[PDB]
Symmetry: D3
Subunit: 267 residues, 6 copies
């Protein structure tokens, strides 16, 4: 009777292949099995302590996650290491964990496309090729507006108590922007690609001080919205999975993780 976890993942991978992930990237099942019948699937950005308690509490069998819980090989299983207590808790409660990291950023109609839609960036192509006719990040054109207006829009659309604008002068704020590059997560190394493709502005998280200076030297303005604009992953993958439940008659519950894992609170 119960839906195998593996038939949920079969559906996910048809939209978003494992092999669309950049080389060297974590992908796919990392913890547990998919061979068994399940009732509940959660979508999360990260798995921290609060995410584990929440999965236990809500009776979750599988978590589909963007950032891998095993990001490097595990040296030992000492219960005194906090990362190991997470693994121990998942294993004890038979919570399987499946990773969709850079492949969701690359795929057509994936996270970076969501970004483009929410901001009205159009006629998009990707930033850096990762495979035949695909790549990470996006660049496209907007209805012209100034740098400051783009900044106000980003802060609002993404719900930010905090936006970092990257510029030196006050007159940059009135520079018209009509071509915008965007890359969720840590995309600062795709900036020369955004520059070669004609970006007026690059939006990406985790922009190092020195690289921000380099961009500015290249004549490229920037917006750093932080790494948390990626929570869109949660509502969007939950919403897609639920559309599948309804269309295909699935007997599962689909839940977005509510436990915030954002470590950074401004001012």
């Amino acid at each position: 009777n119960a839906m195998l976890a593996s038939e949920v993942i079969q559906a996910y991978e048809a939209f978003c292949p494992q092999e669309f992930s950049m080389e060297g990237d974590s992908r796919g099942l990392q913890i547990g099995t998919l061979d068994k019948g399940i009732q509940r699937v959660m979508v999360a950005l990260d798995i921290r302590e609060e995410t584990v308690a929440e999965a236990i509490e809500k009776g979750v069998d599988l978590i589909i996650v963007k950032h891998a819980p095993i990001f490097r090989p595990i040296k030992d299983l000492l219960a005194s290491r906090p990362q190991n207590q997470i693994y121990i808790d998942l294993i004890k409660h038979d919570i399987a964990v499946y990773v969709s990291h850079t492949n969701i950023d690359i795929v057509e109609n994936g996270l970076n496309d969501w970004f483009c839609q929410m901001l009205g960036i159009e006629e998009t192509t990707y930033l850096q090729e990762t495979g035949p006719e695909r790549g990470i990040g996006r660049i496209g054109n907007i209805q012209p507006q100034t740098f400051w207006e783009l900044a106000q829009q980003v802060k609002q659309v993404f719900d930010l108590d905090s936006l970092r604008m990257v510029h030196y002068q006050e007159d940059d704020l009135q520079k018209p922007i009509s071509r915008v590059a965007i890359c969720g997560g840590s995309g600062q190394s795709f900036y020369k690609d955004a520059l070669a493709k004609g970006a007026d502005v690059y939006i990406t998280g985790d922009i190092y001080y020195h690289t921000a200076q380099d961009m500015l030297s290249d004549g490229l303005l920037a917006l750093d919205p932080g790494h948390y604009i990626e929570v869109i992953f949660v509502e969007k993958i939950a919403a897609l999975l639920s559309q599948w439940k309804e269309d295909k008659g699935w007997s599962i519950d689909i839940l977005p993780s509510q436990a915030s894992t954002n470590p950074f609170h401004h001012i």
Copy 2:
């Protein structure tokens, strides 16, 4: 009898030896010569285009800098590379460039000590040993106060228009803090040292999303004041050298750089 640039540097180095730099770190003279007589020394955090223009306009011969302009080996001298254009303009106007990077962070009465003085952190020692009874970072005790008060004190003491607080739970805000670690610039890899030495809070710049989560798993709160709290370098080292100049009867002018090379403007 113009003062040799080497004699300024000799004075600087008796205070802050090149050898106190962390291994592999840039140090000392990078561009030009210190064997000619000079008129003016500028102190800077970075050398960007505006620093170069400012130095040219003010007739500077030597710049004392914290962040090295030659930070990796140079592949070519193509003018079309913004970094080379900085090099080009320094060489043409005979501006010598001297680096004091981690040694100022490590030295007694250096940058991390100035921070401790400004925040009232007493009975200090270092976080990571880098040599005979010395190292990078500082940890000590404050007059007790809550996490939020410390964060407010940090925001004001450093003239920040935003500071990142690292916590998850609203009630972290009310947590009594009495032991504090601090490390100018990119100090997140010393957080275990802070934790081992009994810090309730770690103040450091450029804290990655995932490291912040790890700190919190370890039960360590943090404050990320961004990279620019290290402009204290400019003010303190210009004053240190102006005082030497006055006391010792030096025939040079010592100027603090005031072209901002901060790429980050909040909201």
Copy 3:
């Protein structure tokens, strides 16, 4: 209830973690030692039937010779047999402590037991691993022929078979008076055996080609396999038992009974 770490303090004062060879697994690898415990199993290996035995017997701590984590773990996929062992241990809160090469090295450790068992006297070590300590042993015996020693090794260790390393018939009659030994996989110490006067070298897991090279050097050899190191189970259990008695411990101490020998002859 005594903490598991109070058993390990007693173990580590006999057999320090540091006496392990450089880069070798040592100490606690899975679980914790700061909870009260009731039962400790001594095992040579942890395989599926060691896990099942530890579960059925109510084991809190397993002290083991061969590490269950012998290299970094890449994922925690249930479909990998090695992860299934980890999974079961974690779920049953079974901690696992490793004593691999240190027990080999220490005085009255694994290789000293073999010596006592075979009458190897006035011993020293093969390769140096620390101040006046090292892996393997070499000393002297009452002279016997190669064939007499081989009968004795097969008998003393209860072996269905033994591999003798030699090419010729008259090697069997060669008088043997100095003997080297290293439990487990010590073929790489054979040049030290030879340098220190060994007529015969007894060790496990001798490659075809290495055996030939030993013989080319004039060194005869005996390969009893790896299983002679189960001595570890009975001997470490008797040590813990002795400590229980002396110190008034209330733990039960269990030598593992689940055979993890994969090799059966003929």
Copy 4:
């Protein structure tokens, strides 16, 4: 007198140098093939008593399975036993040609002989090494129990002992119908055996820990040792003999009689 290279042309048309696995020793390693010759020895290994035999018998060329130069030579010091073998060959103008993994791979090569010997039918390879070719074999047998197969392997190869890999009594009664085999040191191919439906994997030189991992995967195993590859000597000599007859060669062909097996049981 026929050139040694005219024997090797015939060998290489059966068993090409290229069919060797990547990075493996192959072909001529010592001497030359462009002088007339009278005698060719087939050997498995070259050790001191193979050298002495080649000298006494007037051998010009040795075709061997295991390379005598298996890594670069650092010096030519007479006091190293391996150099003494080189020294004697060079002084007696004995050339040495290597056929290591290629003879394993080729059709009617080493692993096909084992199949014919054991009744393994409708075979394919374990790991791919080239276009429709690879190392090891897997195919089907008339179903028998694990214990029946083990008796047959011990008997068919004339073994003083055989290592069976299993933990439990009732493994002996397990019906076996699909069998993998790789002469020599093919434990690293065992995942391919398992992937392709093997109930049992027969190979040499199975490490203690690998054996346990095989068993964890449900794969039973038999370790007959390395010496079952002496089949190479008799079989390649009969091939050369057949060519001598067909082509009117005047060379004598000698299977080496000097046993270089280092391992004798009990």
Copy 5:
């Protein structure tokens, strides 16, 4: 309407593509820019101090050079390094520097072809393939003569005050040669190629003592004319560019460098 330096280089490159350089070899522009209009191009073998002085005195804007002045990455720009002082003086007088190193050796009607023409080596092909029907070095047939005569011809044809003959035995001198390999500069690692293609003699520079013994063990005679036979580069490329200049009506002067940078004076 001054001619863009890039237009000279485009003309040069249609003849001798950068891509014909051996992999890892320096190529193309190394110092400065080619986007400004210029007056004068100098051709040189090397750029040493005298080349720099000569270029400054003659008002040169672009130097086309065979041996790269940036031949490994630059660790610093310290004036006390003679190599940096060359860089410094080029940058200050705005002399751009363009490298044609192995591509001129490989290209048809390039340096090794000019040598063959001068020595009468016919029916040529290359020694080592470096791409689609092309490579470095040349081998062909001469009108037969003895080894000593060839050596005398080489000494004169190239205006050498010494040449090294590679042989052991007085009677090698009388050996009939009819097949000859040649490779400008450091070509001793192509000698097996020469031997395989049937050379009686190999002409190449910078032949190590031990390699020469190896050639001779293989029964290959050699001639070492030293590095300076590659000044032909200067003369031939200056003439090539002056002819283009005249035919195409270019508004630039093309000068051969005549400051000798040969460090080697015999007896």
Copy 6:
């Protein structure tokens, strides 16, 4: 009765320890044994074909050689490789080969000291440290003479049909020299050491074109006498061994190799 080869080597190593050789260098016995009684020892620079025939012809049991016959590990023993035919010939005739390479250059009263004596270079120390209070090359002072006079002296003292002087100008020829660095063999990489130690002139073999240019940029003149000035090794080690024969009553013949192995014959 017959002297063991190993007692000859015991005497050699007491003058010239194996362990005085630079790290990574070949040293000591490479081919054969020293355990047997011998009649004849030859001293050679190199072992080539002609050196082998000569050793066979003269009935030599041991060769003491400066340049190692096994200079890297041997991949196979194909008799078709010329270097392998040398080994095959040595082995068949039981000729043992012993190497004394960089240790003879380092030791007190070794090859570089012979050079100093023959040229009257005095108050010598070594160039580069290789061990406690020892190193390779020498530098000392001469009775002042011009560069040209030093060159004429070197050519004569060493019997050269060929000396390469390293300078750019004709007035360098009259520059007074009073401090001279020397290193037999390939010592061009010890030149900065010669420069830091006050050399006016550096004498060494196998000086690459580009390095000669570098020296000249450093203000260091040079003389390249080729790699064959090292034959002094032959007469000097033969002369020392024979002095030992006579003093210690040895029953051996001592011969210097006469077979020239010089591959390079000038003009």
